[PDB]
Curated annotation (Swiss-Prot), chains A, B:
Family: Belongs to the glutamate-gated ion channel (TC 1.A.10.1) family. GRIA3 subfamily.
Residues of the full protein shown: 417 to 799 of 888
Highest taxon listed in the record's lineage: Eukaryota
Cysteine disulfide partners in this protein: 203-258
General remark: The postsynaptic actions of Glu are mediated by a variety of receptors that are named according to their selective agonists. This receptor binds AMPA (quisqualate) > glutamate > kainate.
Subunit structure: Homotetramer or heterotetramer of pore-forming glutamate receptor subunits. Tetramers may be formed by the dimerization of dimers. Interacts with PICK1, GRIP1 and GRIP2. Found in a complex with GRIA1, GRIA2, GRIA4, CNIH2, CNIH3, CACNG2, CACNG3, CACNG4, CACNG5, CACNG7 and CACNG8. Interacts with CACNG5. Found in a complex with GRIA1, GRIA2, GRIA4, DLG4, CACNG8 and CNIH2.
Extracellular compartment spans: 117-258
Subcellular location: Cell membrane; Postsynaptic cell membrane; Postsynaptic density membrane
Protein name, entry field: Glutamate receptor 3
UniProt-annotated binding residues for L-glutamate: 86, 88, 93, 139-140, 190
Amino acid sequence: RTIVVTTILESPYVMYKKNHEQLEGNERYEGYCVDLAYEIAKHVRIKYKLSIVGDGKYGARDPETKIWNGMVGELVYGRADIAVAPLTITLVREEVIDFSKPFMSLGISIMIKKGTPIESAEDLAKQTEIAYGTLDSGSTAEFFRRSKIAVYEKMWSYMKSAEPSVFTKTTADGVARVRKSKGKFAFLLESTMNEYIEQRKPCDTMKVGGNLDSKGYGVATPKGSALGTPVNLAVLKLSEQGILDKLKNKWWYDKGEC
Amino acid sequence: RTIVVTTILESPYVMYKKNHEQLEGNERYEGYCVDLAYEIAKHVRIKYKLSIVGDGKYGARDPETKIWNGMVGELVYGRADIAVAPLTITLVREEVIDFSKPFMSLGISIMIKKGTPIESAEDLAKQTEIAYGTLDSGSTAEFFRRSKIAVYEKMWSYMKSAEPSVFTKTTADGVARVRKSKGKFAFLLESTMNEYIEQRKPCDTMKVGGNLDSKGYGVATPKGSALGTPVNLAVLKLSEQGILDKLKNKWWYDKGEC
Ligand SMILES: C=C(C)[C@H]1CN[C@H](C(=O)O)[C@H]1CC(=O)O
Ligand SMILES: C=C(C)[C@H]1CN[C@H](C(=O)O)[C@H]1CC(=O)O
Ligand SMILES: [Zn+2]
Ligand SMILES: [Zn+2]
């Protein structure tokens, strides 16, 4: 009856409101994905409750246990009805859950500290003075792991052997490390996050080059679900009324501090 | 057994090869969508035959007869198995057919003759010296028709009353009219086509501003079809192996004459 929407803390998708400790239920949270979930639930006509996923992950299958973790896992095992999050639409995920058409478009991109002499992945690849890394798990790591393009294989071989580790746990962590490494560390992250951070004080980062790939985030539901179709048409309607553009502007640029 | 793939002539998606009159079947054609269809059919393991849609349309429902026309129509009425074309993923279409995840990302955009004093839709909207129009039917017309954003309503009201008609039949026609109007006509078209034309001689056009929206083209199949799922995973695989990027580069930029 009250449907379970699994989500995850990630700025500016889902964040605690300033006085969250005095608040209850969905009121604790705000952000792009909270507003999206509200809009979708209005069109599909459902009451829902946002739940932060317990294990803090997006969704991968353990090669040993074959268990899906994260939000994908909550859907696969029947413990959530919908996931609304910056969940990258990937083939291994699409094989076990259903994604809506993308609510957001993006690509893997490069974050540098202002003044770093790097404009492209090719600049990074041909050197070692400036270190570079992805998140430890997620779709970006996986892009590099699986790539068969020369530049990207190089980069992956470099990252997978670099001492000490170039990979980081969270967006915050990768960003802190760009900001503290005096130009000697670039972070490979999705363009959406990169763009957001660039408009945040201290305004010492920038996105450089084009993106390395082209993909989307999708709202996810379990296979066979009766919410699949209405959720999909809901994303398209919202896209077509301009509401997805409006919410991106709201959370990325209306408040931009740079 | 040999599955019917409906398509349409549109450069550089599907074009006649130089010696097409001496050739037979799928060999008559080349382009981005011909290569896509080949790649998809390889992964899904199907033999197929490309058919140019008889009525030369993409897909709309007549408000009087309720008949779907064009490629969408061929799928809806059972006369084609798959459509592979620059078919924009729209809600009214998604309600009657199935689209794969997008194979290409894009948006409505502005084409000007080089030297026209226009950088944005806002520049166009606030004036009449420089005329502007969309194709007569398609997703772009429909964007403007349905928009509730102020700038775009203005533009739509202007276009729907302008004398003589600002709307044109085909991409070629809109382009010819940009090129012959001495800077007094701008064409609103999808960014993909705009980008292609900009790399074609006489190199007298350019794309200006950002896009007005964000959407994709999808491969389409009839609702309930056994090819739906494999086609969808096939697009994602191809996206993930870099083949969609490779084909775009091939048809848009490898040969670019500007
Ligand atoms: C925030 C992180 C862990 C997520 C967000 N989208 C990707 C995902 O859906 O896997 C991850 C980012 C990345 O891999 O660069
Ligand atoms: C080539 C034309 C008629 C097609 C291509 N995509 C759009 C469609 O799928 O409707 C149309 C373009 C447009 O509306 O600007
Ligand atoms: Zn707190
Ligand atoms: Zn000919």
